[PDB]
């Protein structure tokens, strides 16, 4: 693919419907542990080990420890220059009658914290719960999410399983439900929300410009989103520290932290 910014900036100068798809690179640049590999571990596991309905079924305490860690750690993280540039870009192009939509794979809400409005969080949120009994989805920023998790979730291996009994894990507070809560996060082996997918479809169908920022394009179906946009001929710009299995299907490929390239690229 090209690495010519002047040429990217041509299309960008005129684009009316920009779709910006983001992945864990963008969060990593804020200091958010994304447990992707080849050295993204929590104790002895990575996301694909613990972010699964099987992991949750067999050890709900350990999965809760993991997401508890990840919730707490966010207290000190801020959005980075890439987040801000995306958010200001939206605000600016907005005024000019031009559309910017963010489609994120990330569950950390940094795009929201930065000021992004048109945000599709296709894999859910660290700060939302769903009740496994009644299905209610609720925002939850509570630190700690429950008393029994106070002081738990330490990432060092060797760390002992808290083994909270399920009664003392996060429970639904809807009168007379009592159900066990889970993170409102799309796990491996689960479906994305079809209502969210239809939105994403509408956005990809109607876009004239597409950016794919800090994604390693190995997570499906999100990995198909940008290639689909390049398949109607629409230019896709990959912003990434590395090349990916998707790279040669795109128009551009800008190397480096999204924090460095995006503020230039979306000025």
């Amino acid at each position: 693919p090209s690495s010519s910014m002047a040429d990217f900036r041509k299309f960008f100068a005129k684009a009316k419907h920009i779709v910006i798809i983001s992945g864990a690179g963008v969060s990593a640049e804020s200091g958010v542990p994304t447990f992707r590999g080849a050295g993204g571990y929590w104790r002895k596991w990575q996301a694909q080990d613990l972010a699964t309905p099987l992991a949750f079924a067999h050890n709900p305490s350990r999965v809760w420890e993991f997401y508890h860690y990840r919730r707490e750690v966010m207290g000190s993280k801020e959005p980075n220059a890439g987040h801000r540039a995306i958010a200001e870009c939206e605000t600016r192009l907005g005024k000019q009658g031009r559309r910017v939509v963010v489609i994120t794979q990330n569950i950390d809400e940094l795009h929201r914290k930065a000021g992004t409005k048109n945000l599709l969080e296709i894999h859910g949120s660290l700060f939302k719960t769903r009740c496994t009994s009644c299905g209610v989805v609720a925002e939850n920023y509570k630190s700690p999410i429950c008393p029994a998790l106070s002081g738990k979730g330490a990432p060092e291996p060797g760390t002992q399983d808290a083994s909270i009994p399920v009664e003392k894990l996060p429970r639904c507070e809807e009168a007379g439900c009592g159900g066990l809560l889970r993170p409102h996060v799309v796990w491996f082996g689960e479906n994305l929300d079809p209502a969210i997918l239809e939105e994403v479809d509408r956005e990809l169908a109607h876009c004239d410009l597409c950016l794919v920022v800090g994604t390693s394009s190995v997570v499906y179906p999100a990995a198909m989103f940008a290639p689909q946009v390049a398949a109607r001929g629409v230019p896709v710009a990959e912003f990434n520290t590395e090349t990916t299995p998707a790279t040669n299907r795109f128009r551009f490929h800008f190397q480096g932290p999204c924090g460095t390239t995006l503020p230039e690229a979306l000025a």
Binding site: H123, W187, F188, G189, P221
Partner: peptide
């Protein structure tokens, strides 16, 4: 036909 969330 769309598949569940997977790592390839």
């Amino acid at each position: 036909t769309i598949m569940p969330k997977d790592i390839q």
